[PDB]
Amino acid sequence: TYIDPETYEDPNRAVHQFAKELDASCIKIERVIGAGEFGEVCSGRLKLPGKRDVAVAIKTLKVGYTEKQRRDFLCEASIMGQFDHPNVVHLEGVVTRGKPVMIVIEFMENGALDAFLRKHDGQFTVIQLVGMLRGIAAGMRYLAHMGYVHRDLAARNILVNSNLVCKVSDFGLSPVRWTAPEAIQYRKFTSASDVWSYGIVMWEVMSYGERPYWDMSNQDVIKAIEEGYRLPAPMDCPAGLHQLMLDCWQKERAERPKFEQIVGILDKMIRNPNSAHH
C-alpha cells in the first residue's frame, strides 16, 4: 500500500492525501536542533485537542523557496504520511500554504542515532545495542512489506527517542560507503540493497557511531569491496552479530538476508546473548 508521490500528479496533491495540514498557530518553535537540506530542523510542541500538548521536531522550508524546492521538501511528508509502525517516525502533519511551510514529526529526545552513540561511547550493553538494531530491522521489515525502498538508510538517518527505541526516518525525496555495489554501479535500489545499508548501520551502532571505512576515499571503498574487503567486528562486537553484517554485505543480493530474518536472528541474540559468538 505504498503509493509513490512521483507517479501521482504533484505535491500539492500527494501531501494533501497523506499529510494532515496543521494550524501554524498550534506550532511552538522552541529551539534549532540542526540545519537541514531546506532549512533549520527545530524542537517544539504541537497543541492537539483533548490530548496534552505533544513534543515535536519541526523541519522548516526556509523563506524564498522556489516552487521546485517546496515540492521536493513536501515529498518527505507524502511518503512518511503512509506509514504506521512503532519503528518508523510518526508524522504529526505539515504546513503547505498560508503560513511558514513545515513538516511536524514526533520529537525524538535523543536525536540521530549516529551523533547519539558518539556521545554515549562504550555506555550501552551488546544486548542493549542488539535491541536498537532490532527496532531498525522491524521498521525496515515494515517499510519493505509495504513496497518502499529507502535508498539512503544510515545511522545518521535513524532517530533515537528517550527509551532507546530507534526509528527509521529521512524519507525524501523519491551514500557511496552506505550504498550496495549493484546500486552504486547500476542504480538498482531494492529491499536487497536496503539490507547492505542496514549492515553498515549495524557496524555504525556496534562501533558507537564511527564513520564506515574511516578515511578511505569513496573510490578506495569501491575498489576494496570489489576485491572482497568487508568492515571488521568492532571492539566488544560478537562474531555471530558480526557475521549477520557479512551476510548483509554479500556481493550477490539474492544471498543477503531478508529483514524478516534479520529480526529473528537478532531476537535469538537478545534472548540468549552467547549465540552472538556461536
In short:
With 278 residues, the chain is an alpha+beta fold. 36% of the residues lie in helices and 15% in strands.
Could you walk me through the main structural features you see in this protein, from its secondary elements to its overall organization?
The protein is of the alpha+beta class and 278 residues long. It has 2 domains: 93 residues, 2-Layer Sandwich (Phosphorylase Kinase, domain 1); 167 residues, Transferase(Phosphotransferase) domain 1 (Transferase(Phosphotransferase), domain 1, Orthogonal Bundle). It contains 9 helices and 8 strands. The strands form 2 sheets. It has a 5-stranded antiparallel β-sheet with strand order 1-2-3-5-4, with helices on one face. It has a 3-stranded antiparallel β-sheet with strand order 6-7-8. Strand 7 and strand 8 form a beta hairpin. Helix 4 packs antiparallel against helix 6 and helix 6 runs antiparallel to helix 8. The longest helix is centred in the middle third of the chain and has 19 residues. The protein is globular and about 55 Å long. The PDB classes it as membrane protein. The entry lists the keywords Kinase domain, Mutant, membrane protein. It forms a monomeric assembly. The entry is titled "Crystal structure of EphA7 mutant D751H". The protein: Ephrin type-A receptor 7.
